[PDB]
Symmetry: C4
Subunit: 256 residues, 4 copies
């Protein structure tokens, strides 16, 4: 229909995106002002009405999209489903309303592309992340059995051990706060903690670098495709096509 | 005119740059000596006169440049505008006079190229930086509402929360100083702080690596252009021109 | 024989790997539950029987493999030898039974490939690691002689000095906890500690980056070979073969 | 002469390097044992004689080299000059004798190549290092003037400010130890310290990454040259030579 097509063009315009972005920012500002515990009853009531107005504008925006794309066509996108859930959970009584400021990511295409690159890079580091998880679990069981009776606040149970080993991997007071006090009772505890630090810092840096390198390459391809319609072909494909042109001319020269 | 041309050649010489660099260093040294609170009145007066002499030499230098390049031609460069502002603000009464040691960057071309590469890499990481800003704002609102009444020095208001979340992202006493004391009152606070650390450290490292990788490539191109007049063409352009030469010879062999 | 061939196909199936993986996870869960010191005698007895059952399943699995591959054929693989040692040490009475959760790495091929890439990258960083070791040894001898009599808990002997220099390299309380107290007695101690930090942080980051970059490239080749049978040839080999095709056609055109 | 040639072949053999390496290790071990303050007079005397024996073996080694290469030919190498200085300073009475364990780097060629790559990468990061130095100097002058009277232990003078800003750049107790106590007196001090941290951590990581990336590439070329006599030509040179072969065959086909 012509009407649904005029609505799609309104939705996909730069001005509509700018208005929705401004309402997300306004809603985020009123939720930030609502943290101020010194506000008067009238000021709080006013800010709650601005929040209610912002939420109504998002309802109109979402309904406008579902009509212009169709129920199955709208829910086909993960970003639209996210926008729908974020707005729908506010209707029908979580206390974390500030999470709808995440709509700045879903509404702005360049920010959406950064997050997409990070999410798409996750499967590729799954085995490095599983290796770190295995090391953490093994270390937490060992630390609990080794130090739980003598240092129960840090290692009294599996949950406590996982927490203090995460602190140890981040290098936060690992020695003055944790390992020197442990070594006063268990002199060889450095044999456990120093290899734990070497392994986890190497593995977490491998995990982070793997995410970053891949996310940057995916996002760069997505930026190229969003502007020109296509991305730069990999150097391997360029060299493959160069070799194909050489086979075509070699078959020639030989007998032609 | 011949005079303006002789002045331009004086300004663009290696000896003039070396003299201006020496005056910036001398001015920086006298401002560093002026921090010593034990100095006599005569010693302070002497150093203030050396500072005044340095500032007069920069006025002569700047005027010499504005005459030799023209008002619009001088202000066409951002570095010249910076040099002009830095010297002009000293005339007419900020207390931070030490900021004119930044002229070492604007005067030395290799240092100027490092800063240029860093500034030019900023637009390309704008979406990663905006994502970190969104995460910080959301986390600061949540932390204020969750912990502000029980830990008001760290999370009593939005400003306090942003400050302590910046400390938490840098891993500084995050656990022994902040999260273990918070968990004594809110046992599940690790559910907030550990994902906050994982997300912000990954995102800030993505931001820093993106700046560094791009700044290094831009600065390297600028060094090449400043020495030879041109930079190394990207491998994609070399492979494109190689494919063009193959099309020219294939059209040949086929029927020639 | 046909029987050994039917057993090999059972062992190499996805379902057999999934069952062995589930038994490793179950054994890891019962060893994690056994850390809970509040368990009843009956609960502990039950968990010890589940652990015994898991260990028997691994014995059947290992025996099944040794028969289907031969004694020399099974021990030809380092992963099979690891699986054998891990299970065999449990029979005949270390207290660290949780180390058999490392079998998740040896049993899952994608996790095995991550560890293989890390182990294979170690020879290539051996000289960077030896340089860090030389710097640590020299610094520990100097720190012991310089500060051992005045700060014996941190530098009283070589072992203590190596431990506190490892803490200093990780930047943990290096200044508020170690160097400011040392400088109260030895004012120029920053001349030792600040160059030590600059050198070791640069060298350890070189060591970690060298491991990560190489492990990622080796693991990526191993993933390619495990799926297609071969890996992507290096760009140097592609350009070498491209130059060979040009020599074949140049010898032609010249006189043909 | 034949004798000098037989001596050069002895010096350049793998067995002579292995003997000199073993004497460096032995000398390092006796200097490490000499740190033990509980040793008897006889044990100390014995270790000092082993140190004296090691030093005599290095004198014979150095003299053997100066005769076999000539005075100007020996001193032509920076490593030989280093080996000469290190041994010669021990004769004629620094207390840091442990520095002759640095001869492990000069004697072992693969370790020598790592250090060479790091030294050769230094000129290329000189402008990034100068930028960090300029930022540190400016910040130290500002911090001294801003906080020196209220926090004289940390910022009382330029030297104190440089030290605590180096601690702040390493993120060590930057907030709980330095900036929160400063903000109790100067509430806006975060406006100084947070941009200082952002700038210096970005710049020091740029400095470290620039050193590492270049040192790794130089060392890899040096390893290739030491084994085969030549290094891998850069991809740019391979593509340049590929384009030259295309010009030779295009001039042909056109009219041949
Ligand atoms: C891979 C990273 C995994 C990090 C998270 C692991 C710990 C999660 C469980 C947990 O933290 N607790 C269990 C829920 O009660 C709370 C405590 O057991 C523990 O945090 C102790 O530190 C307490 O003493 C705090 O007061
Ligand atoms: C993205 C990074 C953003 C980091 C900076 C955010 C905080 C900026 C505002 C601010 O720090 N203050 C507001 C100006 O008054 C001061 C305090 O609210 C706060 O710093 C508390 O820590 C006080 O208790 C200090 O004494
Ligand atoms: C390359 C990294 C090497 C790091 C490990 C070096 C130290 C290993 C030896 C060691 O730590 N000790 C010797 C065994 O007794 C124990 C103590 O000498 C020392 O840890 C002191 O800190 C004590 O005061 C602890 O209570
Ligand atoms: C680019 C990195 C530069 C870091 C090094 C800068 C400081 C060097 C000078 C120095 O540290 N001192 C001057 C020599 O006396 C000593 C003290 O002024 C200072 O260290 C204070 O912390 C004292 O209170 C220690 O007790
Ligand atoms: Na700390
Ligand atoms: Na740190
Ligand atoms: Na600390």
């Amino acid at each position: 229909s012509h009407m649904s097509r005029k609505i799609r063009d309104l939705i996909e315009s730069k001005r509509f995106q700018n208005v929705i972005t401004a309402i997300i920012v306004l809603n985020g500002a009123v939720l930030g002002l609502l943290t101020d515990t010194t506000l008067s009853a009238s000021s709080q009531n006013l800010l709650e009405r601005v929040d209610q107005l912002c939420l109504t504008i998002f309802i109109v925006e979402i309904s406008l999209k579902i009509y212009a794309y169709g129920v199955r066509g709208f829910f086909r996108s993960g970003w639209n489903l996210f926008d729908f859930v974020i707005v729908a959970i506010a209707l029908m009584p979580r206390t974390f309303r500030i999470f709808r400021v995440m709509r700045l990511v879903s509404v702005i295409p360049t920010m959406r592309r950064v997050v997409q690159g990070m999410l798409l890079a996750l499967p590729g580091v799954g085995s490095v992340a599983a290796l770190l998880t295995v090391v953490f679990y093994i270390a937490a069981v060992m630390a609990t059995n080794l130090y739980g009776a003598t240092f129960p606040e840090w290692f009294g149970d599996l949950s406590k051990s996982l927490y203090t080993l995460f602190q140890v991997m981040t290098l936060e007071s690992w020695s003055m706060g944790i390992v020197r006090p442990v070594m006063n009772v268990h002199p060889n505890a450095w044999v456990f903690f120093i290899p734990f630090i070497m392994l986890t810092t190497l593995t977490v840096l491998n995990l982070f670098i793997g995410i970053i390198v891949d996310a940057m390459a995916i996002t760069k391809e997505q930026e190229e495709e969003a502007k020109t319609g296509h991305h730069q072909e990999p150097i391997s494909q360029t060299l493959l096509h160069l070799g194909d042109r050489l086979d075509r001319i070699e078959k020639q020269l030989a007998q032609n």
